Amino acid sequence: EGKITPVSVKKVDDKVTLYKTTATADSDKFKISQILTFNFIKDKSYDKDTLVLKATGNINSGFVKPNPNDYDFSKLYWGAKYNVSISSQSNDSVNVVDYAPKNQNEEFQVQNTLGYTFGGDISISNGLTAFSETINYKQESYRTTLSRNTNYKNVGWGVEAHKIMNNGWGPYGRDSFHPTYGNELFLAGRQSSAYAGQNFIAQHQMPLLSRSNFNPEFLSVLSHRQDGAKKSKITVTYQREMDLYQIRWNGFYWAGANYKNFKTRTFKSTYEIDWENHKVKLLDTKETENNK
Ligand SMILES: C[N+](C)(C)CCOP(=O)(O)O
Numbered sequence: 001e002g003k004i005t006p007v008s009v010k011k012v013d014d015k016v017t018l019y020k021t022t023a024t025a026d027s028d029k030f031k032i033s034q035i036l037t038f039n040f041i042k043d044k045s046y047d048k049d050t051l052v053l054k055a056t057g058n059i060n061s062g063f064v065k066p067n068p069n070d071y072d073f074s075k076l077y078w079g080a081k082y083n084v085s086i087s088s089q090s091n092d093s094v095n096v097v098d099y100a101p102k103n104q105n106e107e108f109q110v111q112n113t114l115g116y117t118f119g120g121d122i123s124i125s126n127g128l129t130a131f132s133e134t135i136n137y138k139q140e141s142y143r144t145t146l147s148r149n150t151n152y153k154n155v156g157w158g159v160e161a162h163k164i165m166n167n168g169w170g171p172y173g174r175d176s177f178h179p180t181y182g183n184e185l186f187l188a189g190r191q192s193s194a195y196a197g198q199n200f201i202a203q204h205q206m207p208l209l210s211r212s213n214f215n216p217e218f219l220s221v222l223s224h225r226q227d228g229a230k231k232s233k234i235t236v237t238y239q240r241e242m243d244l245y246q247i248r249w250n251g252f253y254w255a256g257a258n259y260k261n262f263k264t265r266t267f268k269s270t271y272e273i274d275w276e277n278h279k280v281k282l283l284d285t286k287e288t289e290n291n292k
Contacts, residue, residue, distance in 0.1 A: 001026050001285065002034075007278050015044045015118060016130045019278035024057075025236075025269040027287050031060030031213075032238050032267040040278040041131055046120035049224040049275050054133055055084060055236060056217050062242040062265055063203075063211040070197035075246035076186070077263060078206070080174055082214040083239040085147060085156035089270070091232035093225040098122045099155045100135050100219040106143040106162055111136050114219050122221055135217040141165075141207035155220050161243075164207055174243060174260050182255040186245055190254050196247055199254060214240075222273075230276040233283070239266040264290035 002024035010018040019040040026033045035057040041050040061079030088094050100112040102124055115123045116131040128134050141164045147156030163171035164185060170176075172185045181190055186200045203211045216238070224232070244262035247254055270284040 012130050017042045018131055021280055023280055025285050027267040030265040030267055033057040034238055034269055038280055041116055051222040052133055053220045058213055058215055059238050059240050060213045061211055062240050066197045066200055068197040071195050072249045074196035075244055077242045077244055078210045079240050080243040081158055081160040081241040083158050084216050084218050085237040086220045087235045088153040089233040089235055091229045093228035094232040095152045095223050096155045096220055097223045098221040100124045101144055104145050108140045109138050135219055137217045142209050157218055174258055183258040184256050187247055187254055187256045199247055224275050232273050234273055235268055235270045237268045262292045
C-alpha cells in the first residue's frame with residue numbers, strides 16, 4: 001500500500017538525461033516498508049537503456065520478548081535473517097546486469113558507491129561520471145551474502161545473524177551448539193536460580209537487527225536492449241526469517257535451542273516499468289506468512 005511520485009528530470013549533458021520516480025509499498029501488518037527509487041538513465045552514446053533501482057525502507061525484526069512467568073521452559077522469537085530480492089519477471093530484452101553490494105560482507109557498516117560513466121560503464125567501489133548512488137546500512141553481528149538464485153534476471157541479498165557475542169562468550173550463530181548447553185546465543189546463565197522467562201540476556205545486549213529492525217539499502221542495475229517491448233515487469237520482495245530461541249532447566253543446568261526460520265513474514269510488490277515514459281505502476285502486493 002502506498003504512492004508513486006511524479007517523474008523528475010535532470011539533463012546532465014546533451015547525451016545523458018536522468019529521470020527519477022519513487023514508489024512506496026507498505027505492510028502495516030508485518031511492519032515492512034518498501035521505498036523504491038527508480039533512476040532511469042537515457043544515454044545517446046549507449047545502445048542500452050539503464051535503470052538504477054535503489055531499494056530502501058524498513059523490515060521489522062518480528063522480535064517477541066519472553067513471558068517472565070515461564071519457570072522451567074521459555075522462549076522468544078528474534079529476527080535472524082533479512083532477505084531482499086529483485087526479479088525481472090518479463091520481457092527478454094531486460095536483464096539484471098550489476099548490483100551493490102556485489103560480494104559477501106560482514107563489516108558492521110556496509111558502504112558502497114555505484115557510478116555510471118558516459119558511454120555505459122558501471123563501477124562499484126567500497127565506501128561513499130554522469131550518475132552516482134550509494135548504499136549505507138548497519139548490520140552489526142550479521143553478514144550480507146548474495147542469494148544463491150542470483151542470475152541474469154534476478155538478484156537478492158541475505159543479511160543473517162553471524163557472530164553474536166553474549167557477554168565475552170561466543171561468537172554464536174543460528175547453528176551453534178554446545179554438547180551440554182545447546183545453543184547459548186541468548187542464555188544468561190548456565191546455572192541461574194531464575195525463572196526461565198527471566199534467564200535470557202537483556203534486549204540491549206542483543207544485536208540491534210535481532211530485536212529491533214533492519215533498514216535496507218540495496219542497488220540493482222537493470223539493462224534494456226533497446227529492441228522489443230517498452231515495458232517490463234519487476235517484483236521486489238522484503239522478508240524476515242524469525243528463529244524460535246528457547247531455554248530449559250533439566251534439574252541440573254540450562255540448555256538452549258534455536259529453531260531456524262520457525263516463522264517467516266514476506267512482502268512482495270509487483271511493478272510494471274515503462275522504459276519509454278520513465279514511470280512505474282503498481283500491479284500487485286502480496287503478504288505471505290509461514291509458521292512451523
Ligand atoms: C553466558 N553463557 C551462558 C553463554 C555461558 C556461561 O555463562 P555462565 O553460566 O558461566 O555465567
